[PDB]
Design a protein around this ligand. Structure first.
Ligand SMILES: CCCCCCCCCCCCCCCCCC(=O)OC[C@H](COP(=O)([O-])OCC(O)COP(=O)([O-])OC[C@@H](COC(=O)CCCCCCCCCCCCCCCCC)OC(=O)CCCCCCCCCCCCCCCCC)OC(=O)CCCCCCCCCCCCCCCCC
Ligand SMILES: CCCCCCCCCCCCCCCCCC(=O)OC[C@H](COP(=O)(O)OCCN)OC(=O)CCCCCCCCCCCCCCCCC
Ligand SMILES: CCCCCCCCCCCCCCCCCC(=O)OC[C@H](COP(=O)(O)OCCN)OC(=O)CCCCCCCCCCCCCCCCC
Ligand SMILES: CCCCCCCCCCCCCCCCCC(=O)OC[C@H](COP(=O)(O)OCCN)OC(=O)CCCCCCCCCCCCCCCCC
Ligand SMILES: CCCCCCCCCCCCCCCCCC(=O)OC[C@H](COP(=O)(O)OCCN)OC(=O)CCCCCCCCCCCCCCCCC
Ligand SMILES: CCCCCCCCCCCCCCCCCC(=O)OC[C@H](COP(=O)(O)OCCN)OC(=O)CCCCCCCCCCCCCCCCC
Ligand SMILES: CCCCCCCCCCCCCCCCCC(=O)OC[C@H](COP(=O)(O)OCCN)OC(=O)CCCCCCCCCCCCCCCCC
Ligand code: HEC
Ligand code: HEM
Ligand code: HEM
Ligand code: HEM
Ligand code: HEM
Ligand code: FES
Lengths: 60, 117, 49, 145, 98, 386, 29, 70, 385, 29
């Protein structure tokens, strides 16, 4: 579409901007996939975590 | 040979049918598979032939390589119009080998030598 | 008969047939697709970084 | 030492339980069925005195005596300490002891398999785009057969 | 001469050392065992095969064809006892403990 | 000459890399079976880096080796990743090289003028086997000890020099600390020789160019290397990385024996001693003979035949596409080689003795038969001509 | 010199951004 | 290592003027049928001995085990 | 020509060895100061071989390292020869490279078109220093432990980031077992990188050929390498073997410090800490400046000046024979870099601080002045006619 | 042509054997 052409003209008339764009995309996508996998991991198996044992503080 | 011939042996006609099919589907003759880097006498046999025959050989080789890269085969009509096994190189090769032997017998040095790799 | 390879040199026609057995072409007149190419390739350069 | 260990058990050495799940074939299930598997010997076989019978041992006769028995321990959560519950808890503990890195491993694995599949898709597109020019080229050669 | 010197020095540097050769002979003690059974023992670096055979084992082992064995010998020379059979425990085939 | 500079890529500084990587001409119909050489190069690099970082936490002594490996896995940040990459990358490296070898066998790449390449490849294979076997010992488990014992005491079957060379190899009277430290040093040294042999192998290939799925002259239609085969190599590398990481992260112990998590104990023997999965064909061929001298000297024909394939000089067609009978023989040889692999991991009794003695016969009839097609087919143009 | 100066400015900016990210690595920035 | 005089003529088209992906999944069933019909013999010859030997070993082992019983 | 084989030396299988060792044209008036590169290659091969055989008996742990070395040197058949060859071949290797550098600095071999060779040489020198210093530790004596502590804690003179760097380099909070294991692995790895750098060095030399004691165009009168310079190199190697054997057999402990025969002890300290004899000029330079940051930031200008010698567009005459003042300055610098080494071993006190502060001034003033003769010698052809 | 070559081969074998008995000096053989 025209959005692809707009993005092309905005970002790629130089090269250092391209390098910065790649680095930023990497260090955003990393965080996004981390959040997604952590959330799915939490959802899959509820009740088994370390903060879910009912007797965690009764050996004083 | 008593059993290599297709005339008398039924396990050679099948062999030639298979080879002819596989050669036609790429459009090249059985003598096209001999390599000048392999034997070093095919180089002389090809060096002595007329120019047009060698040019047709090069064109056929390039056609087959393009076909293989594209992952396809010649159409059915250009498959019917094909003649593998129509030699152009056997007699010259036999003659070159005969001279090689006759020169070896009476002393004499070789005319060309393979290079150490 | 004239060679097939020489009849195509002295006949600069402009009606050209490519080999569509693998890749189809866009109809003549349509724009290029360079921007979409950069779009697709950045998504892998991110991963490699 | 090991000498005292063999002395106190009749010449049989009780092994180390750190890696006991990874060390034999099919660890988890082997340990569980071994614990819960002491049984009455079949007809026609006899065991020398000082040994016990267990079909889950290669040889048919083992040295250790049965320990897991109903009420052998008293939990702090109110769970009926049956032999099976105790065995399950023991095997879970031993599996954690052998492989303490399992969860971190699985998280990294999921993330990077997903990401690398995406990169494979991109590389395939890149390949096709580059080879398009040769793979649709047309040539005329002037030869029939 | 110099090349021979260097080659020999480097190749003999890899042979067994004085520490290992110092511990290469001794005598230690065993314990009792039932007739026809065995409890393996330990030495410098090699176990000890043991067997004090019963009557039927004596019958079966001492009554095999002599020529069919690739090293023809009878156990009477190999055994030092009418019932016992102590042989150094290293496999002469491949060095394992069979 | 070009009395003023044009490109950095044609200057003397980058002439070698340019000529042998970027502008080098290759056939344009190479398929995906030509990527495994580069893929094996990357596997070797992975092995070297991972090993240089494991050897910062491992102590070569009989009292400490097992506990130092477990210290790495339990107490160093990410150390489990290093150990799993190393112990599974050895297997990946062997897999890739086996596929490379069978590619070479199919399209008949050993023939003229490329027999120097084949001979250097065989030497590289020997170095690989020695390196892997020497390096399976340092963890000092049960299989490490007993595999070292069996294989290195198989060298006393030789006549009179036997016991002497075995005792000199072991550094003493049995497999103990001296052998461990010796093998560690050899393991750290051999892969650099492997690197040198690989570079020589590549130079020997580049002095004549590569073959192609057709086996014909290929000097009329060639394309450069970059960017046309770089992208194909890229596809291969990414698929390989997915496979490797499936091994590392979700099944890191399927390709090993459980007995190496028991510290070495010289008195008790395991009931079933085998080496890794990529030595089982040789191991089966070796135990197939009821004689020590014959068993040891039956490996020598394997390497002699593999090293003497290139020097038969009658066959004229290279690719197996136009050779039906040799193609069928190739597939049957592959099946037989897999059968040897499976047999090499079984107890030695019926019915495995016959099935362990016949496949060696087939594995040698392969290297005996092939010249006969050479001769019988050299005269094929004269019979089928039209 | 101006296009070259601003090209160098952009390259220095890329390098400085990467170096700053090396110094502090905030997960949720 | 040299080249040859050729005399050919070729036409080409730019990368950015032609559809790229749709070629993979165009007519899969006929390609699958061609591959199977062409390489059935190679598949047979590769997978025959393994099956035969496996069945033979299984049969022998079960027969021996069941004959050793009481 | 090429229609059948004449010589097996001119075949592809041995074409490049022929071209770069047998036939390679060299100027015919080269003197003996061109043998030390080959001699250094010999020394490097000796180090690699004796190392690969020494590391077959050594155990890198803080409980068993000193004992491993003593067991090697006291209990293995001929192991004393291996250990002494290693520990003295390091000294021989450093001596050979110092003579090599000074030869190249006399006949001005750094200048165009041979500055890529100079740069690769400087990189090689860094690799040599790193490898020797890392490998003086594994025997784990007093000097090993305290030298490692001092030198690797000099790395905290850097601003804020420095402490993290030091903690990462030590593997913990002090010098301990992790440092020993890490240092052993690095020591085993680095020499192969050193070999690769040497090969690149040699190819970059061969792409132009070598200089000559006259510093002039020398392409009209040249000869082959074999057999004319191979015999000269043989004479050099034999004299070298005599020198090496004298050190190995009749005085093997003269080139070390006695304190490395005391097992490591973190509580006591030796009263005199020094590094191995061939690190002393750098030590004196680093202790000359009374400031940690200045200490670390003095050695970087040293290597910067060394690596930026060949880029001063300068005088048109190379050989210092036709240059009286550059000759005198060369002898002054050579005397100074010996005085610096001798000072780099004495106690840190008067008078040694002044005589350790001025020599570095001179050692930098050498690189400062040298462009000025080039600029002022541009005009000799227009004056002395 | 054969005699000179075979004599030279035998003498080279003698030289190889002498070298082997130089490197190793066994009086038990
Ligand atoms: C490169 C060519 C330069 C030759 C360097 C000479 C050398 O390394 O031998 C000194 C070398 C250093 O060992 P050391 O001085 O006994 O060790 C310090 C002692 O603890 C006792 O220390 P000290 O009180 O004797 O003083 C230490 C001083 C010794 O002072 C001397 O130089 C004495 C003169 C000999 O050490 C040095 O001078 C080393 C400075 C040279 C380092 C590299 C210079 C770069 C050259 C450019 O051996 C000797 O001192 C005498 C050896 C006699 C044979 C000389 C043949 C040299 C080859
Ligand atoms: C495990 C114990 C192993 C011990 C050794 C066992 C060796 C068994 C080998 C048996 C195979 C036979 C080998 C015969 C070699 C020579 C045969 C030959 O044909 O050479 C001739 C040929 C050129 O001669 P041609 O032109 O054909 O004759 C002219 C006639 N007018 O020559 C050529 O074509 C040149 C081909 C050169 C390529 C081969 C070079 C040797 C192989 C390279 C591997 C060695 C590399 C090792 C690297 C590390 C070294 C330690
Ligand atoms: C061991 C130490 C060996 C040192 C290796 C020397 C460097 C190898 C040469 C690299 C190379 O590219 O050589 C190419 C060579 C063909 O050389 P050529 O036909 O004369 O044309 C090349 C034009 N530059 O193609 C070749 O045949 C390379 C030579 C084969 C390697 C044989 C090495 C034997 C030494 C053992
Ligand atoms: C060149 C080829 C080199 C290949 C080298 C390895 C070949 C296969 C090695 C192997 O062991 O595969 C057989 C595998 C092992 O079975 P396993 O259960 O471990 O042995 C009995 C112990 N209980 O059992 C399997 O079936 C796993 C499948 C492995 C690949 C198929 C093996 C072909 C033969 C199987 C049927 C006969
Ligand atoms: C036993 C030898 C049997 C073959 C004897 C000569 C028969 C010649 C022949 O053409 O056999 C054809 C057959 C497969 O070849 P083909 O006809 O091309 O089938 C292709 C189908 N996609 O067969 C073959 O080409 C391979 C025959 C297998 C060889 C087995 C050798 C043991
Ligand atoms: C840190 C170091 C880590 C280790 C690095 C690995 C070192 C391995 C050494 C292998 C050397 C590589 C061999 C090929 C490089 C080479 O020889 O370059 C030749 C070049 C000669 O220049 P020229 O003759 O003008 O080039 C045209 C003719 N081919 O010579 C030159 O001019 C310089 C070329 C440098 C090599 C390219 C990089
Ligand atoms: C900080 C306080 C400084 C105090 C000292 C200052 C003294 C004045 C320095 C003037 C420098 C030039 C004067 C040198 C001598 C002048 C005489 C002359 O021009 O002849 C050149 C002379 C060599 O004499 P020559 O030509 O070889 O005689 C035989 C020929 N038939 O050449 C020579 O004799 C040697 C020339 C080089 C050495 C003299 C200059 C050294 C200055 C050191 C600079 C820094 C060095 C640091 C490294
Ligand atoms: C009476 C002391 C003793 C008790 C307490 C004990 N064991 Fe054992 N255990 C032994 C002995 C003795 C052996 C060695 C058995 C042999 O070699 O025949 C052994 C062996 C084992 C083995 C190895 C079996 C194999 O196949 O090699 C496992 C697993 C095991 N025990 C699990 C357990 C578990 C789980 C518990 C806690 C419920 C436990 N043991 C408690 C004495 C004991
Ligand atoms: C570390 C091990 C190896 C490496 C790095 C390696 C690498 C390579 C590379 C990069 C190529 C050229 C690129 C290609 O054709 O894919 C090649 C070609 C070749 N290799 Fe290897 N290889 C190795 C092992 C082997 C082995 C063990 C053999 C045979 C036993 C072998 C036989 C061949 C052959 C025959 C070719 C010819 C290629 C052709 O026909 O075009 N290689 N190798
Ligand atoms: C410089 C190169 C290398 C170094 C320094 C190195 C180092 C090591 C070390 C320290 C170990 C013991 C640690 C452990 O077993 O967990 C080891 C094990 C091993 N190495 Fe290497 N290695 C190198 C290259 C290679 C190569 C090239 C291969 C195979 C081609 C290889 C194969 C193995 C194998 C199979 C093991 C067994 C580990 C196991 O099974 O647990 N290594 N290596
Ligand atoms: C392991 C260390 C070294 C080795 C093996 C080595 C080897 C060589 C060799 C073999 C030559 C040619 C032979 C000759 O001209 O004598 C050479 C030349 C040269 N080297 Fe090195 N070198 C080493 C260290 C260095 C260092 C550290 C430098 C400088 C800091 C250096 C600078 C030079 C120069 C300038 C030449 C030019 C030769 C000429 O002027 O003709 N080298 N080197
Ligand atoms: C593959 C290459 C090498 C290996 C395997 C190796 C191995 C070893 C080992 C095991 C030690 C400890 C034993 C002992 O200290 O006596 C050692 C010490 C040492 N190495 Fe190496 N080394 C290698 C290369 C080098 C090189 C190239 C140098 C260059 C200077 C070097 C310098 C030293 C020094 C100075 C020592 C200590 C001297 C002493 O013990 O007094 N090493 N090396
Ligand atoms: S030691 Fe008995 S078969 Fe190996």
């Amino acid at each position: 579409g025209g959005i692809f052409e707009a993005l092309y003209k905005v970002l790629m008339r130089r090269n250092s901007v391209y390098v910065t764009f790649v680095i930023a995309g990497a260090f955003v996508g990393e965080r996004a996939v981390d959040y997604g996998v952590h959330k799915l991991w939490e959802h899959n198996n509820v009740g088994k975590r370390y903060e879910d044992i009912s007797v965690l503080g009764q050996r004083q | 040979q008593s059993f290599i011939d297709p005339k008398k042996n039924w396990f050679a006609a099948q062999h030639m049918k298979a080879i002819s099919k596989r050669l036609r589907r790429f459009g090249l003759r059985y003598d096209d598979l001999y390599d000048p880097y392999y034997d070093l006498d095919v180089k002389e046999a090809l060096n002595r032939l007329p120019k047009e025959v060698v040019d047709a050989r090069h064109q056929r080789l390039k056609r087959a390589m393009d076909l293989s890269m594209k992952h396809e085969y010649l159409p059915e009509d250009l498959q019917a119009m094909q003649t593998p096994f129509r030699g152009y190189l056997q007699e010259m090769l036999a003659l070159v080998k005969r001279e090689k032997a006759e020169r070896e017998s009476l002393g004499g040095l070789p005319l060309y030598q393979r290079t150490i790799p | 008969e004239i060679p097939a390879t020489v009849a195509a040199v002295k006949n600069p026609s402009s009606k050209i047939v490519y080999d569509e057995h693998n890749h189809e072409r866009y109809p003549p007149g349509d724009p290029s697709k360079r921007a979409f190419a950069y779009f697709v390739l950045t998504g892998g350069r991110f991963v490699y970084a | 030492n090991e000498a005292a260990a063999r002395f106190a058990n009749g010449g049989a050495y009780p092994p180390d339980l750190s890696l006991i799940t990874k060390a034999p074939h099919n660890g988890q299930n082997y340990v569980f069925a071994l614990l819960t598997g002491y049984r009455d010997p079949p007809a026609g076989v006899s065991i020398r005195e000082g040994l016990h019978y267990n079909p889950y041992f290669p040889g048919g006769a083992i040295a250790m005596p049965k320990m897991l028995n109903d009420g052998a321990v008293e939990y702090e959560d109110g769970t009926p300490a049956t032999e099976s519950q105790m065995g399950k808890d023991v095997v879970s503990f031993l599996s954690w002891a052998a492989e303490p890195e399992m969860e971190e491993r699985k998280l990294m694995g999921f993330k990077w398999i997903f990401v690398l599949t995406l990169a494979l898709l991109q590389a395939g597109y890149y390949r096709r785009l580059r080879w398009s020019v040769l793979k649709s080229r047309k040539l005329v050669l002037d030869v029939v057969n | 001469s110099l090349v021979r010197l260097l080659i020999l020095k480097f190749v003999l540097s890899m042979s067994a050392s004085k520490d290992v050769l110092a511990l290469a002979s001794l005598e230690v003690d065993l314990s009792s065992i039932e007739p026809g059974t065995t409890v393996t023992v330990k030495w410098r670096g090699k176990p000890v095969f043991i067997r004090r055979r019963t009557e039927d084992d004596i019958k079966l082992a001492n009554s095999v064809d002599v020529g069919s064995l690739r090293d023809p010998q009878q156990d009477a020379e190999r055994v030092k006892n009418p019932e016992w059979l102590i042989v150094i425990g290293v496999c002469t085939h491949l060095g394992c403990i069979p | 000459m070009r009395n003023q500079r044009f490109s950095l890529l044609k200057q003397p500084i980058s002439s070698t890399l340019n000529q042998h990587l970027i502008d080098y001409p290759t056939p344009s119909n190479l398929s995906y079976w030509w990527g495994f050489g580069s893929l094996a190069g990357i596997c070797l690099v992975i092995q070297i880096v991972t090993g240089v970082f494991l050897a910062m936490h491992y102590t070569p002594h009989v009292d400490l080796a097992f506990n130092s490996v477990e210290h790495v896995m339990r107490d160093v940040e990410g150390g489990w990743l290093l150990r799993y990459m190393h112990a599974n990358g050895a297997s990946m490296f062997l897999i890739v090289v086996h596929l490379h070898i069978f590619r070479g066998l199919y399209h008949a790449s050993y023939s003229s003028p490329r027999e120097f390449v084949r001979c250097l490849g065989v030497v590289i294979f020997l170095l690989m086997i020695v390196t892997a076997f020497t390096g399976y010992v340092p963890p000092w488990g049960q299989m490490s000890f007993w595999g070292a014992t069996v294989i290195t005491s198989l060298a006393s079957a030789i006549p009179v020099v036997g016991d002497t060379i075995v005792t000199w190899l072991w550094g003493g009277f049995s497999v103990d600390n001296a052998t461990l430290n010796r093998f560690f040093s050899l393991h750290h040294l051999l892969p650099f020789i492997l690197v040198g042999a690989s570079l020589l192998h590549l130079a020997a290939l580049h002095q004549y160019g590569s073959n192609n799925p057709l086996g014909v002259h290929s000097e009329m239609d060639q394309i450069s290397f970059y960017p046309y085969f770089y992208v194909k190599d890229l596809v291969g590398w990414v698929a390989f990385a997915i496979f490797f990481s499936i091994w590392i992260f979700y099944a890191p112990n399927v390709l090993g024996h459980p007995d190496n998590y028991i510290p070495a104990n010289p008195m008790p023997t395991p009931p079933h001693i085998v080496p890794e999965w990529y030595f089982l064909p040789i191991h089966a061929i070796l135990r197939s003979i009821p004689d020590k001298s014959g068993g040891v000297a039956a490996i020598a024909p394997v390497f002699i035949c593999l090293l003497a394939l290139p020097f038969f000089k009658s066959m004229y067609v290279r690719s197996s596409s136009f050779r039906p009978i040799h193609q069928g023989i190739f597939w049957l040889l592959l099946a037989d080689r897999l059968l040897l692999g499976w047999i090499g991991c079984q107890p030695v009794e019926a019915p495995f003795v016959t099935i362990g003695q016949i496949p060696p016969l087939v594995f040698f009839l392969f290297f005996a038969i092939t010249p006969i097609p050479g001769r019988v087919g050299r005269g094929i143009p004269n019979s089928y001509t039209d | 010199i101006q296009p070259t100066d601003v090209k160098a400015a952009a390259m220095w900016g890329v390098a400085a951004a990467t170096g700053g990210l090396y110094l502090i690595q905030p997960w949720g920035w | 290592k040299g080249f040859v005089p050729m005399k050919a003529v070729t036409y080409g088209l730019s990368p950015f003027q032609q559809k790229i992906m749709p070629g993979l999944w165009k007519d899969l069933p006929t390609k699958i049928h061609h591959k199977v019909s062409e390489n059935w013999i190679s598949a047979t010859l590769l997978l025959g001995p393994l099956v035969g030997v496996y069945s033979y070993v299984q049969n022998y082992q079960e027969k021996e085990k069941l004959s050793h019983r009481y």
